[PDB]
Amino acid sequence: HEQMFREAVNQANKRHLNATSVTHKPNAIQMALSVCEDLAILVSHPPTPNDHFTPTPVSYTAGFYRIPVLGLTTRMSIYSSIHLSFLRTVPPYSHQSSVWFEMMRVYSWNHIILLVDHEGRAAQKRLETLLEDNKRGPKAEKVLQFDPGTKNVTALLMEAKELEARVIILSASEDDAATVYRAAAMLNMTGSGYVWLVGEREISGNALRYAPDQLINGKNESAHISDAVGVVAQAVHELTDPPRGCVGNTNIWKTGPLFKRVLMSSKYADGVTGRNEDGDRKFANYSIMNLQNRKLVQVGIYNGTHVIPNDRKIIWPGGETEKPRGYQMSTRLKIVTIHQEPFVYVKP
Amino acid sequence: PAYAAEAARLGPAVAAAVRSPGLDVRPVALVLNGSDPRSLVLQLCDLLGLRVHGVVFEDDSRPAVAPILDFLSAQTSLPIVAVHGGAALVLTPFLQLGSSTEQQLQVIFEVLEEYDWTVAVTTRAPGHRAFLSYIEVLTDGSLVGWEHRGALTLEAVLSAQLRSVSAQIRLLFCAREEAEPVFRAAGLTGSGYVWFMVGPQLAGGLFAVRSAGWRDDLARRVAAGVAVVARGAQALLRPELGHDCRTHRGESLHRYFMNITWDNRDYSFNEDGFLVNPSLVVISLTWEVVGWEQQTLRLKYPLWSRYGRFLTQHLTVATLEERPFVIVEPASGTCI
Numbered sequence: 001h002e003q004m005f006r007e008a009v010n011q012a013n014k015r016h017l018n019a020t021s022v023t024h025k026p027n028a029i030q031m032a033l034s035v036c037e038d039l040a041i042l043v044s045h046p047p048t049p050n051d052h053f054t055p056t057p058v059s060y061t062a063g064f065y066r067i068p069v070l071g072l073t074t075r076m077s078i079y080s081s082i083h084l085s086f087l088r089t090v091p092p093y094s095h096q097s098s099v100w101f102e103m104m105r106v107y108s109w110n111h112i113i114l115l116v117d118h119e120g121r122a123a124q125k126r127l128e129t130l131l132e133d134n135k136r137g138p139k140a141e142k143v144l145q146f147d148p149g150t151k152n153v154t155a156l157l158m159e160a161k162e163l164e165a166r167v168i169i170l171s172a173s174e175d176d177a178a179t180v181y182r183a184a185a186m187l188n189m190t191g192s193g194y195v196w197l198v199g200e201r202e203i204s205g206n207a208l209r210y211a212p213d214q215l216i217n218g219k220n221e222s223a224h225i226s227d228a229v230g231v232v233a234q235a236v237h238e239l240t241d242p243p244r245g246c247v248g249n250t251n252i253w254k255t256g257p258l259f260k261r262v263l264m265s266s267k268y269a270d271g272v273t274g275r276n277e278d279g280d281r282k283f284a285n286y287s288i289m290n291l292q293n294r295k296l297v298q299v300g301i302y303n304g305t306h307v308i309p310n311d312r313k314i315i316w317p318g319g320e321t322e323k324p325r326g327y328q329m330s331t332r333l334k335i336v337t338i339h340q341e342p343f344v345y346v347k348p
Numbered sequence: 349p350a351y352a353a354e355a356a357r358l359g360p361a362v363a364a365a366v367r368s369p370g371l372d373v374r375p376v377a378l379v380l381n382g383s384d385p386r387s388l389v390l391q392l393c394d395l396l397g398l399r400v401h402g403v404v405f406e407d408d409s410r411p412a413v414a415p416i417l418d419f420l421s422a423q424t425s426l427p428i429v430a431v432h433g434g435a436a437l438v439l440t441p442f443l444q445l446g447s448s449t450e451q452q453l454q455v456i457f458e459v460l461e462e463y464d465w466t467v468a469v470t471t472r473a474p475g476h477r478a479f480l481s482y483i484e485v486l487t488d489g490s491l492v493g494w495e496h497r498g499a500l501t502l503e504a505v506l507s508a509q510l511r512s513v514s515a516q517i518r519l520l521f522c523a524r525e526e527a528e529p530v531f532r533a534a535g536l537t538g539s540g541y542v543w544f545m546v547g548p549q550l551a552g553g554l555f556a557v558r559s560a561g562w563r564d565d566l567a568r569r570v571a572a573g574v575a576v577v578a579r580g581a582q583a584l585l586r587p588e589l590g591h592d593c594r595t596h597r598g599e600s601l602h603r604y605f606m607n608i609t610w611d612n613r614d615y616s617f618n619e620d621g622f623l624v625n626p627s628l629v630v631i632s633l634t635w636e637v638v639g640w641e642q643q644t645l646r647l648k649y650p651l652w653s654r655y656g657r658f659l660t661q662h663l664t665v666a667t668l669e670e671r672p673f674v675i676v677e678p679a680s681g682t683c684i
C-alpha cells in the first residue's frame with residue numbers, strides 16, 4: 001500500500017524543503033532501525049497493521065526524536081505518556097462510548113448498565129466522568145472489570161440479569177464480544193428488554209450477535225489523507241528547522257515540543273474530514289445500527305450532540321423487536337431484620 | 349565509566365559468587381556504547397548464542413530510553429534489565445529500576461504528619477493526573493487537607509498565580525526546564541516555604557526524596573542487577589524468543605521474578621513494575637541524610653519549632669499540670 005502515499009506527496013504542495021516518503025516494513029525491528037536512518041513526522045503511515053501494538057515502536061522512536069506522527073490506521077489508541085505527545089486525528093475509543101450516554105440521556109433510557117483491558121478502564125472512567133432529575137447506568141449498579149479471553153464467563157451474565165433492568169453496554173475485544181453475545185442466549189437468554197452498544201468494529205467482528213444495536217473514514221482512509229497532510233502543511237515554523245540527523249546526535253531538538261504545541265493549537269484550515277487537546281480531534285459524527293436480521297444497517301445521525309434517527313428507527317431486542325420501554329422495575333425484595341421487643345418477637 | 353567496566357568485570361562478577369546457588373554463568377555485561385542509541389539496540393540483539401544469562405548496562409545523564417528497551421524485550425522476549433542509576437515510570441506491554449512516585453508522595457505526607465504542617469500546587473502538568481489524583485486520594489484523611497487549590501505553569505501570569513496561593517509551605521513537581529520558572533517568578537521565594545518535587549527525580553540542580561542507592565555508586569547498582577538476575581534464574585529453575593532480530597508476538601512479564609530482598613534492600617517489583625515496599629531517603633541542602641523502609645517511619649532532626657513566623661502567630665505557652673485546669677493523662681494511637 002504505497003499508491004495513496006505517492007498521491008499524497010504529489011498533492012502535498014497544493015497550497016505551497018522537501019516532501020517526505022516512507023517504506024512500509026511489515027515487522028517493527030527493521031522498521032524501527034530504519035525509522036531515522038531512512039530520513040516533524042512528515043510520514044506517519046501505518047501500512048496495514050495486522051497486529052495491535054506494532055504501530056507503537058516507530059512512533060516511540062520519533063518521539064525520542066520529538067516527531068509526533070499522526071496515527072492513521074488507529075481506532076483504539078492507548079496513548080492519551082509512554083510516547084511523547086504523539087499527534088493523532090482519528091478519535092480513539094476514549095469517547096467512542098461517551099456519545100452513548102448523551103444519546104441515552106435523551107433517546108430511550110436513564111439507568112442502563114455498561115460493561116468493560118486498559119482501553120476498557122479508560123473508556124469506563126471517561127464515561128463516568130462525563131456524567132459528572134438525575135440518572136446513572138452501571139454507576140447505579142456496577143461495572144465489570146474482567147480478564148480478556150475468559151471463556152465460560154457465566155456468573156457475569158447471571159449477575160447482570162438479576163439487576164433491576166436489562167439494558168447493558170459493553171466494549172471489548174472481538175473474542176470477548178462474541179463470548180458475551182453467546183452467553184446472552186444462556187443465563188436467562190438476555191433480550192426482550194435489553195440493549196447493546198459497542199464500537200463499530202465490535203459489530204463488524206460480531207458474527208453471532210443479532211439483538212445487539214460507527215465510523216467516519218475508518219477502514220477507508222481515502223479522503224482524509226489530503227486534509228491530514230494539509231494540516232501538517234501549516235506546521236511550518238515561523239519564529240531551528242526539524243533536524244534530520246540520527247547518528248551522532250544524542251541531544252533533543254528543542255524545536256520539537258515548541259511547534260508540537262502550536263500543532264495542537266492549529267485548528268480548522270481544512271474541509272471534509274478536517275475540523276484538539278493532545279493528539280486527538282475534538283469533533284466527529286457517527287451513526288448507529290440495530291442488527292435487524294443478518295444485516296447491520298449502519299443507520300443513524302448520532303453526529304455527537306445532534307441526533308437525527310430515521311429509516312426504520314429501531315427494533316432493539318431479539319425477543320420483543322417492538323418499542324423498547326427501557327428501565328425495568330423489580331418485584332421481589334430482600335428486607336433487613338433485627339431482634340427487639342417493640343416490633344421484633346422471634347420464637348422457634 | 350569505560351575501563352571501569354573491566355574492574356566491574358571482576359568484582360561484581362565475584363559478587364555473584366557471594367550468592368550463587370549453582371548459577372550457570374554470569375560472564376560480563378559489556379557496554380560497547382559507541383555513543384549512539386540508534387544502533388545500540390542493533391548490536392544488543394546481534395550479541396544477544398545459547399541465549400544469555402542476562403547483562404545490564406545503561407547510564408545517560410538527564411531517562412527516555414525505556415520504550416526502546418520494552419520493544420527489544422518484546423521482539424526477543426528479553427527479561428533482562430539495563431540500568432538502575434537512571435529510572436522512570438512506564439506502563440508498556442525486563443523493566444525494573446528504582447522509582448516510586450506514590451512512595452514519594454506517601455513519604456512526604458508522612459513527614460508532614462510528624463512535622464505538623466497543613467498543598468495547592470501544580471507544575472506544567474507532565475502526566476499531572478497521576479500525582480494530582482494521588483494527592484487528592486491522600487486528602488481523604490482526618491488531619492491534613494487545608495491546602496488544596498492547584499496551580500499551572502507557563503511570567504506575569506505565573507507570578508500572579510503563585511502569589512494567589514502562598515499558604516506558607518508549598519511543594520510542586522515538574523520538569524527542570526519548567527522548574528526554573530519557579531525561581532524566575534512574584535518572587536515570593538520566602539524562607540518560610542519548603543518545596544518537594546517528585547516528577548523531575550534526578551537531584552538538585554533543599555529537601556526532597558531520592559532512592560536508597562542515590563548516594564551509592566554504580567557498584568551497588570550492578571550488585572542489585574546481578575542479584576535480581578540470580579533471583580530470576582533461581583525462579584526459572586523452580587527462552588528469549590530466539591533473540592532474533594535479522595510466535596508472531598510473545599506475551600509474558602515477570603513470569604518467575606516476583607520479589608526478594610538483598611543488601612538490606614527489598615529488591616522487588618510489582619507485576620506493574622512498581623517498587624514494592626522499597627527504601628528511600630530525603631535530602632537536605634543549604635545534600636543531607638534526612639529521611640524509611642519496612643513500611644515504617646524514619647526521621648532525624650526531631651524539631652518542635654517550624655522556622656515559621658514568616659508573615660507572629662505562635663506564642664510560647666506553658667503551664668503546670670494543676671489538675672483542676674491542667675489535665676495530663678496517657679494518650680498509643682492518638683489523643684482524644
Ligand SMILES: *[C@@H]1O[C@H](CO)[C@@H](O)[C@H](O)[C@H]1NC(C)=O
Nearest residue numbers: 009010012017018019020021
Ligand atoms: C528529497 O530529497 C532527495 C535528495 O535530497 C530527492 O531525491 C527527492 O526527490 C526529494 N523529494 C522530493 C519529493 O522531491
